[PDB]
Structure formats: C-alpha cells, structure tokens
C-alpha cells in the first residue's frame, strides 16, 4: 500500500505505482495542456472573426486535434468534454490518422476552415520508404462556434505530393497571406527583378482579397528537406478546391546546416517539419511590410541511422528574403535565409505553431494592444518524442505540455560595437545600420505574450534580493526562497570584458534541497546559457525515464555602449518555473525550455551561483511566487 509522500524518499521504481498516482507532482498550472492524457503538436490556431475569441488547437492522444478558446490570452476554456476534440480520424480521407493543420478564418461558407493532413497509412518517417498516399491535405469547416470541425464530404483538396517527387514527408499545411508573394507572382519575371517596381505594388496591396498560400513541410529522399508551396489556384481568394503548386520555395542539402560549423542554428537535418511563415516588424506582424521569417522543426540523426528514429528535434527559425524563381525551372519563388537561430534551445522543444493575433481580436482590444501580433506556441514533448526509457506515464496520467504563448517580432540590439563578435558568419542576426563604430542589429525577438506575462505576476508575492557581486567561488542562498515550485525569477548579470576569455560560470541554483538542485548559468567558454539537471531529481537515478542530461543554448552578449562607455551587454534573465516546466528567457531574444522534475516539496531554495572564474555582478534580482491558474473552469 503506497500513498504518495513527497516529503519522503521516492520509491526506487516509479513505474510500479498505481495509475494516476503522480498526476499532480510535476503538473503545471499556468500552461496549455489537456485535462489529462498526452498532448502533441500545437496546430490550428485562429481568431474567430465572429467572436474575436482566439482559438487554440493541438493534437491529443495521437487521435486528432483538440481545442480551447481564450478572450484574454491568459485563461483558457476547453471547447468540450471527453477530450475536447475538434476532429478525429475515421473519415474516408483520414482512416488512419489526423495530423497538424491550419485555419483560414473566412473560408468555405465564410466560416473558419481547417486545412489538415489526412493520413491513410503508417508508419511515416524520413528514414524509411514513403508509402504513396500516406498524407493528403483535406478540408473541414467549423461548427457550433469552432467547438468541432466537420470534414467536407469530398476527397482531399491536395490529394498527392508533387508529381514523381520521392518525398520524405508531406504534411502540416500552414496558411498565410503575403503582399510580396502576390506581387512577385503578379509581375513579369523580368519586371519583378527590380525592387523599385515591386515595393510600389506592395503598397497598393489589400489584405482582404489576397490569395492564401500554403506551405507543406517535408523533404525529398536522397536530395533534401524542404517546404512545398501552394496557393489558391490562379490567386483567386475564393478558390478553395484547387491549389496550384508553386514548387519547393525552400530546400537545403541533406543534413546540411546554417554556417559552416552549424553553431547557431543546429542543422537543417533530414526532414523539415511544421513550418510556419511569418511577416514581422519592430512591433508585430504585417503581411505587407514585415520581413519574411519562417519557424520550423528539423529532424536530425547521427550515424549509423536508427530506422524510424530522429535523434535530434531542433526548433529553429530563419529570416531572409523572397525572390523570383531564379532563372531555372525550379520554384516560382524562393526563400533565401539571411540569418537563422533557435526558437527554443530545449532538447524537448519542437513543432511550434503560431498564428496572427489581430489588433481587432477580443484579446488585443481588452488588453489595449493596437497592432497585429504573431503568437507562437512551442511544444514540449513529455517523453522525449516517445523515446523515453520507461517514463512512468501510466502513473502520471498525462504527457507533455505546450510552452507559454510567445510574441515574435523583429528585435533590435542598438549601440553595439561592430566587432568580430558581430561580423561572424552564419549567425542569428544581421547588421541593420553601422558606421563601423556602432551598429544596430536585427534578429528574431522572443518574449512571453504580454497578457500571459502580466497574469503570471498579477497576484504573485514579490521578494527582492540585494544586488551583490561574487568573485570567489560561492553558492549563496537567497535571503528568502519561495515555498512552492510556482514562480518567476528575474535578474540581470553584468560581466566585465575580461570574462569573455575565462571559464566563468555564473547563475542560480533553483528547486533546491540538500538532496536536489537545478543549476541555471551562463558560460562564456561556449557562450551559452546552461541548465544542469544532473542533480534535479532525487528519483532520476533509478528511473532512467526521467531524463537528466544537460540543456543549453547559444547566447552571445555583444560589446556595447551603455552610459557612454563600452561594456559587455547585460544578461537579462527571466526564468518561469511552472512546477516541473522550466522556461529560461534571455534578452527578449532567447528561450531554453526543459523538464525539471524535482521530487521533494522542500526542493524550493534559490541560490546565487559563481564558480570563482571571473567576476559577476547581480543586479535587480527578484522573485514573484504563485503564478496563476490558466484553466479556471476545470
Ligand atoms: O514512423 C513511425 C511514427 O509515424 C507517425 O508519426 C510520424 C511523424 O511524427 C512526428 O511528426 C510531428 C512533429 O512533432 O508530429 C506530428 C504527428 O503527430 C507531425 O504532423 C509532425 O511532423 C515525428 O517528429 C516525425 O519524425 C514522424 O515521422 C506516428 O504518429 C508515430 O506514432 C509513429 O508511428
């Protein structure tokens, strides 16, 4: 007879416990996840034109797309009960499975319309032969306020992958509109070569009757990963049956990668997944003036290759330009990356699905936002993409969660010293404006959606810590630590120029007891925020299912001019700890999320950490405890 006692040592084998015994142990309170069961890819988000409510979707129990709605982008309500499903397999187009999809707010019958990957055969993986007809794209229309999606009574509207192309995958259609694409396709192939003519047409563009484009993710056996582009036939905004194939607007060589050493954006891998096409500005999303950005997941593998196994799941982002379709007979249009990085450096972060969130939305109206935004929902698989070594899934009763909604826009880093640090090849940023003395840098901006950040701190207990410096190695416990695993830790770390060349490691130790701790620090050596989980869980040693490997992401701190002097850019940290779900944010342009499954209720001390190498200044350190409930109606 074993009842859970989180103040006592964990049993040696967690998988021997009764189903659901671990249900609340690591479960978050402020994140998006079903009431129970497993959550897969986030997909099918859209602002309902009628109600202005923002709809969120996600695969659930490998049995279809489930959903929820929100009015504030802080609290959520399930569309229904018993799974809250919107659409499931079993149709003629989708006898085996229902994969990711995207929604056109005003589609068929002028109602929200879902274009999704209908599945008829399994297995499907880039490492094995593709079964013809495995993945097709079908339509379904929203009924009863989006609480369900009825499949149109006909076959798929894109019933096959490109003719005779040996695709490694063909799925996760994502819809978007683009002024630049309509122009490039509307103009002559000779007159669409000079930006002078283009830009002019781009200004007359009208978002309302523009045709929808569709990017499908996958690759080509023996050649490369790629995104397949389609658009309503003939650019007719009212054509929903036929979609003309524009070609592989973006493809890369098998297991190639941004930069020579693949340092800043992992690798393009063997297959591209759940692509998203964004158009940014310094303030939000604008399909007319925004720069072209694409977020995607890439499947990697070492050698030899393990059939049906993707050893690496990188959550990347790329930005660049779109031009005519070269001179050859390839794609009508091509996307050329200028920069690329990670949307989230977490091993278990993947399949992000975002959506434009209009200023006209009930969400932006209520919060006072008056610009169009692009909110992105990143997936945090719960069992390492189903490769976990015996995770106690039956015991937990649920699997996975989505990360906090995030705003994506163009973030600028001003007053930067245009130095080798800036002029490196294959990085996650481009020089905006430089006088060879100081330049502005452009990169993907990553922040917690404002309404969610506010809700996280609204009723939280706040406890500051005095600024302090550490030269010699030390681990200093905060004056006061929270008494629960639900909090937001904020701090700024100032480093002296002499630290770049040192083995310095500075940060914090969270979720700490004498038998447990989780280290989060910055390493100048490879320049990377690190989350050491080797001591995170007292239960991990005998339960390999609880992964404890190190997580880390590259974050460069540039030399800049602050008060009128040069200094190493301040490390601005924001760590949200949702019981076991941990998200590390840095400089409004870095994210590293992972699972920190601490066990003891006592495991809640926070400590300052410095390894004695170099010197670090902690400024403005504080903690907000409590966070909030994202599912009030449950
Ligand atoms: O190959 C065996 C495998 O086939 C099916 O999964 C295929 C596909 O799943 C994952 O792809 C994503 C990324 O998270 O998840 C959804 C599906 O749930 C896809 O639309 C999306 O690309 C993997 O990352 C891919 O490597 C994999 O090829 C099936 O669902 C699995 O249970 C298993 O049978």
Resolution to one decimal, Å: 2.2
Length of the chain: 634
CA–CA distance from 284 to each of 341, 407, 433 (Å)? 19, 8, 20
C-beta atoms surrounding 247 within 10 Å: 18
CATH topology assigned to domain 458-626: Jelly Rolls (2.60.120)
Q: Which residue has the tokens 């007879």?
A: 1
Closest CA to 27 of 607, 631, 456: 631
Query: Ligand 1 centre and the CA of 58: distance in Å?
Result: 14
Determine which residue's CA is closest to atom 26 belonging to ligand 1: 125
CA-to-CA distance for 630 and 634, rounded, in angstroms? 9
Domain boundaries, the chain: 36-457, 458-626
- Structure tokens given for 471: 């030269």
Instruction: Single out the residue of 57, 33, 59, 32 nearest to residue 46, CA to CA.
Output: 57
Question: To which H or E segment does residue 475 belong?
Answer: strand 474-477
Q: Which two tokens stand for residue 245?
A: 């194939």
Helix (H) / strand (E) element for 457: namely helix 450-457
Nearest CA to ligand 1 atom 30: 62
Q: Whose CA is nearest to atom 34 of ligand 1?
A: 123
Write the DSSP assignment of 305-322 as a string of letters: --TT--SEEEEEEEEEEE
Tell me if 139 sits within 8 A of 117, measured CB to CB.
no
| CATH architecture, range 36-457 | 5 Propeller (2.115)
Residue 379 alpha carbon, nearest atom of ligand 1: 14
Q: To test ligand 1's pocket by mutation, which of 41, 94, 168, 297 has the most ligand atoms within 8 angstroms of CB?
A: 41
Kindly list the distances between the CA atom of residue 237 and the CA atoms of 151, 210, 223, 232, 284, in Å, as whole numbers in the listed order.
21, 6, 33, 6, 24
- Same fold: 36-457 with 458-626: no
Q: List all residues 6 or more positions away from 481 whose beta carbon is below 8 Å from its beta carbon.
A: 512, 604, 605, 606, 623
Show Cβ contacts of residue 305 under 8 Å, excluding neighbours closer than 6 positions.
Answer: 127
Dihedral (CA of 365, 371, 372, 373) sign: negative
Of all atoms in ligand 1, which is nearest to the CA of residue 125? 28
Ligand 1 cavity residues, CB under 6 Å: 40-41, 59, 62, 99-100, 122-125, 171-172, 273-274, 297, 299, 308, 310, 350-351
Please measure the distance between the N-terminal and C-terminal CA atoms of the chain and give it in whole angstroms.
Answer: 30
Give the position, in ligand 1's atom list, of the atom nearest the Cα of 126: 28
The rounded Å distance from CA 461 to ligand 1 centre is 42
The answer to whether 460 and 488 have CB atoms below 8 angstroms apart is yes
């Amino acid at each position: 007879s074993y009842h859970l006692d989180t103040t006592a040592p964990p049993p040696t084998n967690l998988s021997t416990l009764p189903n659901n015994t671990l249900f609340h142990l690591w479960r978050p309170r402020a994140h998006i996840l079903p009431a129970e069961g497993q959550i897969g890819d986030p997909c099918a988000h859209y602002t309902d034109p009628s109600t202005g409510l923002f709809h969120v979707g996600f695969l659930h129990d490998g049995d279809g797309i489930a959903g929820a709605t929100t009015a504030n982008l802080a609290t959520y309500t399930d569309t229904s009960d018993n799974g809250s499903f919107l659409i499931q397999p079993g149709g003629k187009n989708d006898p085996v499975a229902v994969f990711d999809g995207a929604v056109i707010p005003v589609g068929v019958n002028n109602t929200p319309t879902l274009l999704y990957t209908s599945v008829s055969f399994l297995p499907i993986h880039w490492s094995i032969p593709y079964t013809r007809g495995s993945e097709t794209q079908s339509l379904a229309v929203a009924r009863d306020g989006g609480r369900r999606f009825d499949k149109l009574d006909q076959g798929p509207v894109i019933a096959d992958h490109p003719f005779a192309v040996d695709v490694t995958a063909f799925r996760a259609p994502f819809v978007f509109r683009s002024a630049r694409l309509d122009v490039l396709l509307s103009l002559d192939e000779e007159v669409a070569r000079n930006e002078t003519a283009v830009q002019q047409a781009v200004d007359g563009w009208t978002e309302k009757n523009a045709p929808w484009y569709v990017a499908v993710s996958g690759g080509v056996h023996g050649v490369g990963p790629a995104q397949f582009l389609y658009r309503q036939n003939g650019g007719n905004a009212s054509e929903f049956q036929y979609w003309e194939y524009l070609g592989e607007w973006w493809q890369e060589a098998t297991n190639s990668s941004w930069g020579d050493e693949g340092t800043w954006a992992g690798r393009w891998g063997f297959n591209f997944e759940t692509g998203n096409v964004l158009f940014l500005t310094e303030e939000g999303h604008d399909p007319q003036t925004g720069e072209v950005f694409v977020t995607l997941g890439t499947e990697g593998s070492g050698l030899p290759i393990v059939p049906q196994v993707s050893s690496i799941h990188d959550m990347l982002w790329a930005a660049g330009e779109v031009g005519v379709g070269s001179e050859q007979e390839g794609a009508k249009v091509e996307f050329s990356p200028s920069m690329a990085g990670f949307l989230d450096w977490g091993f278990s972060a993947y399949a992000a699905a975002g959506k434009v969130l209009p200023a006209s939305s009930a969400v932006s109206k209520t919060s006072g936002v008056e610009v169009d935004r692009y909110v992105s929902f990143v997936w945090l698989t719960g069992d390492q993409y189903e490769q976990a070594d015996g995770f106690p899934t039956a015991q937990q009763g649920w699997t996975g969660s989505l990360l906090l909604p995030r705003e994506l826009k163009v973030q600028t880093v001003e007053n930067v010293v245009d130095n080798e640090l800036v002029r490196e090849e294959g990085v996650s940023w481009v020089v905006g404006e430089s006088d060879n003395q100081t330049a502005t840098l452009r990169t993907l901006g990553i922040t917690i959606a404002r309404e969610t950040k506010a809700a996280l701190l609204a009723n939280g207990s706040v406890t500051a810590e005095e600024d302090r410096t550490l030269q010699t190695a030390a681990v200093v416990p905060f004056a006061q630590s929270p008494s629960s695993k639900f909090f937001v830790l904020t701090a700024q770390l100032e480093f002296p120029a002499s630290a770049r060349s040192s083995p310095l490691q500075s940060g914090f130790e969270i979720l700490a007891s004498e038998l447990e701790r989780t280290a989060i620090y910055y390493q100048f050596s490879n320049e990377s925020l690190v989350v050491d989980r080797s001591q995170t869980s007292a239960a991990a040693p005998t339960n390999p299912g609880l992964d404890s490997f190190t997580e880390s992401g590259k974050l460069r701190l540039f030399d800049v001019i602050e008060n009128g002097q040069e200094q190493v850019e301040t490390l601005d940290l924001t760590v949200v700890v949702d019981n076991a779900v941990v998200e590390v944010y840095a400089n409004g342009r870095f994210a590293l999320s992972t699972w920190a499954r601490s066990w003891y209720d006592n495991s809640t001390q926070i400590r300052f950490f410095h390894n004695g190498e170099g010197e670090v200044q902690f400024r403005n350190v504080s903690v907000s405890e409590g966070l909030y409930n994202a599912w009030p109606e449950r």
